[PDB]
């Protein structure tokens, strides 16, 4: 895949990971 | 309809508006003021296929019909006013406009001044479509 949509996908994955960590308090 | 004027020396003047686009043609005839129309035909009522609404033959048939109606109603001289779709869309007139002009010439009608009334803007409004246009 091209770099732009890969960076968007990794942004979405990082947002999901941050949400899961902030809900795993 | 009929007038008391002589049919030998003087001629009766009207204007005719040829609004032609890439899809359809209009051959409209009004009086000198333009407020009172006479008879309006389009290439959509000369052929029973809307694909051929922009054909030269439909415009030719419409021009012959409107010229016969104006001849039998009492109009013998016309001023040409050509027009495209105007706006920001395009400025080149439709492909049946000069065909309708020639068919108006063949039917026995006098032609006077020829002008164009395309509504050209001073960068009014953005066109329909995206930044990349229509990709076809």
């Amino acid at each position: 895949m091209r770099a732009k949509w890969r960076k968007k996908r990794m942004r979405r994955l990082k947002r999901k990971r941050r949400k899961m960590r902030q809900r795993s308090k | 309809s009929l007038g008391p004027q002589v049919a030998e020396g003087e001629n009766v003047f009207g204007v005719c508006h040829i609004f032609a686009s890439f899809n359809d043609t209009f051959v409209h005839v009004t009086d000198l003021s333009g407020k009172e129309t006479i008879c309006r035909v389009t290439g959509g009522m000369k052929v029973k296929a809307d694909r051929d609404e922009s054909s030269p033959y439909a415009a030719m048939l419409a021009a012959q019909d409107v010229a016969q109606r104006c001849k039998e109603l009492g109009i013998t001289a016309l001023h040409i006013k050509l027009r495209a779709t105007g706006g920001n869309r395009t400025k080149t007139p439709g492909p049946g406009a000069q065909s309708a002009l020639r068919a108006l010439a063949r039917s026995g009608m006098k032609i006077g001044r020829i002008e164009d009334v395309t509504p050209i803007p001073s960068d009014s409004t953005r066109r329909k479509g995206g930044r990349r246009g229509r990709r076809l």
């Binding site: - | 000069q98 006098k110 032609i111 006077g112 020829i114 930044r131 229509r134």
Partner: protein, 101 residues
């Protein structure tokens, strides 16, 4: 690699220019990049001029002309056969194409 001396445009001391729209397409293209064609056309082309001139009210009537400037995107200009591809030595030639009449 770098293909042209300029970058396919004429922007040398600006950084930003006004974008225009294509005629056939609606693509937003900068003004100094789009290929322009100021064509002067007449109302009746080659055979209807005698048709108007013989059947007319005014004698010695000059036929009016239509003036229009066309803005073309690069893909639309190549697709509409306005410009073509040229060789590596003939790419650096900025003269207009020759005209016969």
């Amino acid at each position: 690699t770098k293909k042209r001396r300029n970058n396919g445009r004429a922007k040398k001391g600006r950084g930003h220019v006004q974008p225009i729209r294509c005629t056939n397409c609606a693509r937003c293209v900068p003004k100094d990049k789009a290929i322009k064609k100021f064509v002067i056309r007449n109302i009746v082309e080659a055979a209807a001029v005698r048709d108007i001139s013989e059947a007319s009210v005014f004698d010695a009537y000059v036929l009016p002309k239509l003036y229009v400037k066309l803005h073309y995107c690069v893909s639309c200009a190549i697709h509409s056969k306005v410009v073509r591809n040229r060789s590596r030595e003939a790419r650096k030639d900025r003269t207009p194409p020759p005209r016969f009449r």
